[PDB]
A paper describes a structure:
Bacterial periplasmic binding proteins (PBP) are receptors for extracellular solutes in metabolite uptake, chemotaxis, and intercellular communication processes. The PBPs collectively constitute a structural protein superfamily characterized by two pseudo-symmetric domains that are linked by a hinge formed by two or three β-strands connecting the domains; a ligand-binding site is situated at the interface between the two domains. Solute binding induces a conformational change to form a closed state in which the ligand is bound at the domain interface and buried by the surrounding protein.
Crystals of ribose-complexed tmRBP were grown using a full-length wild-type construct (residues 30–323) that lacks the periplasmic signal sequence (residues 1–29). The structure of the tmRBP ribose-complex is similar to the ribose complexes observed in ecRBP and a thermophilic RBP obtained from Thermoanaerobacter tengcongensis (tteRBP). The largest differences between ecRBP and tmRBP are at the C-termini, where tmRBP is extended by an additional 13 residues that are not present in ecRBP. β-D-pyranose ribose the most prevalent form in solution under ambient conditions (59%). The ribose is wedged between three aromatic amino acids (W15, F16 and F172) which make extensive van der Waals interactions with the sugar ring. The amino acids in the N-terminal domain of the tmRBP binding pocket undergo large χ1 and χ2 torsional changes, whereas the C-terminal domain remains fixed.
Numbering used by the authors: 1 to 292
Write the structure that this text describes.
């Protein structure tokens, strides 16, 4: 057997709880001990985890980086120590240092949502000369933040009726998104929609919109997390999200670490995992964190 370290960006995100626990469970099912290390969105805490993990002689690391550039020195240190690293959900801007990186096709998720954003909103406001909107960005040091925003804009920018009047990071965080949205609503009451880089931000934005009596603002998220599935299902003002498949990601990452540890050496360096569009029209095909 042996032991696997599961190092996660933060556990203050329902989606990362699922990702981390699927990995831990899969490691255990394959006969490893496994420990989850919560970095709390802090690259310094992540580095302390990597020190401790190296000292404890862990056999493999399942890694979700706080910073696509800054987390590289942690990976390098594990590698020097002979500990293979498998990235899950976020990648690093390197190569060779991770055996494999498995994460979603986040650009394509952005494109899927940009399309539905345009479609849903032109349908609600066919004659409007401007449809003003706001974007909540994820954590700026996370690859998915930009992949999703870039992909979204690749579509929505082609439709100049849509005017992005505010753009700000809410750190992939619900309470942060609440405060940020509360400030955005004061400064730009004309917005008719909010596109958010993850579901936690969608939920914070919704709470803020509801508090101001602004239940007319259509909110668009990303992840397929429990309370966003629920919101969409209950007919609330979050009308869509992009389903990711953390259970698949986590499972592959652990299985490959096991396979690596008995000599398997051909894994691809980058594996994109597909995503799907969730709407009011198809919500019944989905549950929290996956299909059914
Ligand atoms: O893919 C994940 C999820 O969107 C999470 O909610 C924030 O971190 C991203 O890397």
């Amino acid at each position: 057997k042996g032991k696997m370290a599961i190092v996660i960006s933060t556990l203050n995100n329902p989606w990362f709880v699922v990702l981390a626990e699927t990995a831990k469970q899969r490691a255990e099912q394959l006969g490893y001990e496994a420990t989850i290390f919560d970095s709390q969105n802090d690259t310094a805490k992540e580095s302390a985890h990597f020190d401790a993990i190296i000292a404890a002689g862990y056999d493999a690391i399942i890694f979700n980086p706080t910073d696509a550039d800054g987390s590289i020195a942690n990976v390098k240190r594990a590698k020097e120590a002979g500990i293979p690293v498998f990235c899950v959900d976020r990648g690093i801007n390197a190569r060779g240092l991770a055996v494999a990186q498995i994460y979603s096709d986040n650009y394509y998720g952005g494109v899927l949502m940009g399309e539905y954003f345009v479609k849903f909103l032109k349908e609600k406001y066919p004659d409007a000369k401007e449809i003003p909107y706001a974007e909540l960005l994820g954590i700026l040091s996370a690859q998915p933040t930009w992949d999703r925003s870039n992909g979204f804009h690749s579509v929505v920018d082609q439709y100049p009726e849509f005017k992005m009047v505010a753009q700000q990071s809410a750190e992939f965080d619900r309470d942060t998104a609440y405060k940020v949205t509360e400030q955005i609503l004061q400064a730009h009451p004309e917005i008719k929609a909010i596109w958010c880089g993850n579901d936690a931000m969608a939920l914070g934005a919704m709470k803020a919109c509801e508090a101001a009596g602004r239940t007319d603002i259509y909110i668009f998220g990303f992840d397929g997390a429990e309370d966003v599935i629920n919101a969409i299902k209950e007919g609330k003002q979050i009308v869509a999200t992009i389903m990711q498949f953390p259970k698949l990601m986590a499972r592959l990452a652990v299985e490959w670490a096991d396979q690596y540890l008995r000599g398997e050496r051909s894994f691809p360096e980058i594996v994109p995992v597909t995503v799907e569009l969730v709407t009011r029209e198809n919500i019944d095909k989905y549950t929290a964190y996956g299909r059914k």
